[PDB]
Amino acid sequence: LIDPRAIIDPSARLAADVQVGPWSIVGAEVEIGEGTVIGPHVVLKGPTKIGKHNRIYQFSSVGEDTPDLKYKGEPTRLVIGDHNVIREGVTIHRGTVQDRAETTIGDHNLIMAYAHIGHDSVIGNHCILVNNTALAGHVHVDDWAILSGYTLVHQYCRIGAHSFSGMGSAIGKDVPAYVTVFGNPAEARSMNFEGMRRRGFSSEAIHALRRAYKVVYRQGHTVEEALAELAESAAQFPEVAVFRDSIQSATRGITR
Amino acid sequence: SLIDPRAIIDPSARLAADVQVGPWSIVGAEVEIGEGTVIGPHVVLKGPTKIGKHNRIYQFSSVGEDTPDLKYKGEPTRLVIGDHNVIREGVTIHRGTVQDRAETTIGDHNLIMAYAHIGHDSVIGNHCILVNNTALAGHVHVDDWAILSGYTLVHQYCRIGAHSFSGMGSAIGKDVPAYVTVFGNPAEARSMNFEGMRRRGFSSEAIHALRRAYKVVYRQGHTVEEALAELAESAAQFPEVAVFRDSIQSATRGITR
Amino acid sequence: SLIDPRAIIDPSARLAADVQVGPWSIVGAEVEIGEGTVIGPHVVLKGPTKIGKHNRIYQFSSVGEDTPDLKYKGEPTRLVIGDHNVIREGVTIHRGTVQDRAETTIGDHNLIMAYAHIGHDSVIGNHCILVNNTALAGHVHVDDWAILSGYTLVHQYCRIGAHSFSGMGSAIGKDVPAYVTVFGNPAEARSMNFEGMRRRGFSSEAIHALRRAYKVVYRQGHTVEEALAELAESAAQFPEVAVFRDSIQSATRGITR
Ligand SMILES: O=C(Nc1cccc(-c2nnn[nH]2)c1)c1ccc2[nH]cc(Br)c2c1
Ligand SMILES: O=C(Nc1cccc(-c2nnn[nH]2)c1)c1ccc2[nH]cc(Br)c2c1
Ligand SMILES: O=C(Nc1cccc(-c2nnn[nH]2)c1)c1ccc2[nH]cc(Br)c2c1
Ligand SMILES: O=C(Nc1cccc(-c2nnn[nH]2)c1)c1ccc2[nH]cc(Br)c2c1
Questions:
Q1: Across-strand partners of B92?
Q2: Sign of the C-alpha dihedral computed for residues C37, C42, C47 and C49 taken in this order
Q3: With contact defined as beta carbons under 8 Å apart, do A161 and A154 qualify?
Q4: Is the minimum CB–CB distance between B112 and chain C shorter than 8 Å?
Q5: Which of A64, A135, B91, C99 has the greatest number of CB atoms lying within 10 Å of its CB?
Q6: CA distance C32 to C108
Q7: Residue B145 C-alpha to ligand 4 middle, in angstroms?
Q8: In terms of C-beta distances under 8 Å and separation of at least 24 residues, what long-range contacts does A152-161 make, across chains too?
Q9: CB nearest C113 (choices: A23, A43, A67)
Q10: Taken in order A34, A37, A40, A42, is the CA torsion positive or negative?
């Protein structure tokens, strides 16, 4: 299962069932969980934890140091959950002590070829990062978010649950939950109604969220005005609280 | 020896005369490689895949991987590559899907530059140039002599017409007619590839007729049906204009405007 | 030992005594590596290439390949890289073409991040940062301390001035004067890199003179030649203004506006 042309550092820790292809490097302090398949020509560096039933494709560099000059070799980590697919040539950097010293990925994420997950980024669950998507650093991607091909995300930006970025988008401000954004610079267009139907949202939840978008984007309310107007919608629908919570946590302004 | 002993050749792989395979390359099951093809070092070939003659594939390329667009792959789905193609460093080419074509198809004399992506069920003709990090999302048709400049992004099902040209960083969401130049995100028509026509040995007559054809379609408020009617006479005189007319006719989902 | 036994070292290669080469790396014929340099695993070095001292080259980089540019027909051309450079994952650097000076040149203390592309005949100075997926198409000159943010695209023959800055996703088709800040596709001139200038310790007087010089070129309706003639005075007083003036005077592709 561990190909004999692979290099497994002695301090690495591999569960039963783990496969490692030829000419891959499982570096010092790299933990891998049961059912995970490392392809050929993968470089893993630690300290890193990889969970269960993950698949990591050739030419990926998972757990290197950020080249960002504000990192100076301090002990920082990367954690990856379960049932993720990391495709060809993905780069994933460990955290920096200036934040939480950890880069974090949840479960059931699909990270397509040549995607870049910068230091200190947090990815939730059931996210899709399409080819060459780049998180510059300290980027938070909530559950079910889809970033289309060559989406560039600026440092510290929050990408909301069920949000969608069009291909070649450049995101400089928080994207609220459910919002669809396009272009360079990114601008809000609508709500991810497909994402909501994928979730089996009641038709009352979807109408509540359709109206919630109007209150924030199409009624000339300021962010403060919107948040108060949404309070009752948010009380009634957990799905609208996700939206309101995402705008409330947007300390530096939302994508318009 | 032409086959480096550090490469992994599957027993079902078929290598023709004068094929070279560099060290640490994988030639997987049902991969066929034609006469005089050079596989670089650190290349992953996955099948079922048919590669023709006098191709060159550079290091860190993943040729014939399954699309990650489906959670559960269909099999068998094919990749077909013709002759005299250059595939540069880190290029990804995905096989077809059982739902659509079941084949990703590349013709002859194409240049696919570093880190370009050719998505499942795409079709590339002959003499095309995909510059660095060009991405064909899926079911993209690129006709003969098209040039896509660096970091050109193409949406699913879009047709890139013969002799067309995309500018650097273009995001293409609708068909590009033959000969048309497009720029920006989202892509906008600007003119025709007059430079390319001259390098192809197009008559000044053909080039003048194609200039007029551009104005008929884009500049004169015609419906497409009206544009097709207005172009019929010029298309019958010039095969070069027929290629333009046919790219407009075949564009069911609209053209880049 | 410092050379991994799984690395390929061409017998013509010249390595200083403390050079490290990781496993499954290639040091090709006529590649020279200076003292203190670390080559990671899975690196492809092709020559004729000279690499200086205390460099670091990461996995999956292709350093010294021929350009795929059709104008290159296999002529003997070179790559020269200086000292204290960092080349991150998957970087591509191509040798020169005889049509220019048969050399691609990189100075010292440069940071070239993952999947950056340095095209044939490019000249990079000292203390430059090319962020992820920056692509220099060919014959691009990047002068000292320039910062090109992520996915910056540079057209052939463009010059990037000293202490200039590009925003993420910039598409530069025209020359960027020294100190100027550009953004967008196509790239737009916004301001000067005042945070760069202050971090580097430029004087308040030089920063004020550069602030006024920006107005002269961009905001007084002067033609390039009229602005150069108006810059004459301040350029004689402040070396920094002369660097600015010179970058406008040396422009081949017009200046980013
Ligand atoms: O972009 C993709 N799908 C998609 C589906 C619906 C709307 C949009 C939309 N609208 N505006 N910009 N992108 C986009 C897509 C899917 C799979 C891919 N694989 C590689 C690439 Br590049 C890619 C791109
Ligand atoms: O739901 C998707 N796209 C979506 C959803 C809502 C509005 C729009 C919209 N609006 N204007 N243009 N595109 C688009 C979707 C689903 C599965 C996918 N797999 C890969 C990709 Br990219 C993707 C995208
Ligand atoms: O940009 C390229 N060619 C080209 C030629 C003529 C007009 C234009 C145009 N005009 N406006 N936007 N792009 C573009 C080009 C050629 C070779 C290359 N190799 C690597 C890269 Br990135 C690259 C880019
Ligand atoms: O672009 C980056 N940083 C940056 C810093 C300051 C201003 C701007 C700016 N402002 N407006 N447009 N771009 C941008 C950056 C830094 C590190 C990275 N690592 C991977 C990627 Br992609 C990346 C991108």
A1: B62, B117
A2: negative
A3: no
A4: no
A5: A135
A6: 16
A7: 35
A8: A152/A184, A152/C150, A152/C151, A152/C168, A152/C169, A154/C168, A155/A118, A156/A252, A158/A246, A158/A249, A158/A250, A160/A242, A160/A243, A160/A246, A161/A124, A161/A242, A161/A246
A9: A67
A10: negative
Mutate to test the pocket of ligand 2, among A180, A191, A193, A206 (most ligand atoms within 8 A of CB): A180
Position C78: which residue type? R
Helix (H) / strand (E) containing B190: strand B188-192
CA nearest neighbour of A52 among A27, A26, A38, A32: A32
Ligand 4 centre to CA of A151 (Å) is 13
* Residue C50: C-alpha distances to residues B46, B208, C36 (Å): 36, 51, 14
CA A83 to chain CA mean position, Å: 14
Q: What is the DSSP string of A219-255?
A: S---HHHHHHHHHHHHHH-HHHHHHHHHHHT-TT-B-
Contact B57, B37 (CB under 8 A): yes
Cα distance between residue A194 and residue B99, in whole Å: 21
What determination technique applies here?
Answer: X-ray
Give the residue numbers of C annotated as catalytic, written as ranges.
120-121, 138
Six token digits for residue B146: 């098209």
Residue A116's closest CA among A74, A81, A67? A67
Please judge whether B58 and C65 are an interchain contact, meaning their C-beta atoms are less than 8 angstroms apart: yes
C71 C-beta neighbours (distance < 10 Å), count: 11
Decide: B82 and B106 in contact? Cβ < 8 Å: yes
Which tokens in the block code for residue C122? 């490019």
* Whether the Cβ atoms of residue C223 and residue C168 lie closer than 8 Å to each other: no
Residue with tokens 């991040």: C113
* Secondary structure of chain C as H, E, C letters: CCECCCCEECCCCEECCCCEECCCCEECCCEEECCCCEECCCCEECCCEEECCCCEECCCCEEEECCCCCCCCCCCCEEEECCCCEECCCCEEECCCCCCCCEEEECCCCEECCCCEECCCCEECCCCEECCCCEECCCCEECCCCEECCCCEECCCCEECCCCEECCCCEECCEECCCEEEECCCCEEEEECHHHHHHHCCCHHHHHHHHHHHHHHHCCCCCHHHHHHHHHHHHHHCHHHHHHHHHHHCCCCCECC
Burial of C219 (0-12, 13-18, 19+ CB in 10 A): exposed
